[PDB]
């Protein structure tokens, strides 16, 4: 047969389930301050003292 010019173009795509928010974590109170901030706070406490 003789196809015409494409009236629409598509391709293989990835389908997933929409991120339904996220379950929390035990030590999730430290999220605001990064790991380094917390580490350096300990070092500054040991130093000031």
């Amino acid at each position: 047969i003789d196809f015409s010019k494409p009236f629409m173009s598509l391709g293989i795509s990835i389908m997933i389930k929409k991120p339904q928010k996220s379950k929390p974590g035990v030590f999730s109170f430290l999220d605001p301050l990064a790991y380094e901030i917390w580490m350096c706070i300990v070092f500054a406490y040991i130093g000031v003292s």
């Binding site: 580490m39 070092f43 040991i46 130093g47």
Partner: protein, 40 residues
């Protein structure tokens, strides 16, 4: 994404060891002077 290694932790660990020696040396200094303030 990164991940600190043992070399960085030695630097961090050095601080702690050094700070502990720092307080210990101050204690020794005070102890010497306390002996002099009791024998005079």
């Amino acid at each position: 994404s990164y991940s600190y290694g043992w070399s960085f932790y030695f630097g961090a660990l050095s601080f702690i060891i050094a700070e502990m020696v720092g307080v210990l040396a101050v204690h020794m200094f005070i102890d010497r002077h306390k002996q002099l303030r009791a024998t005079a």
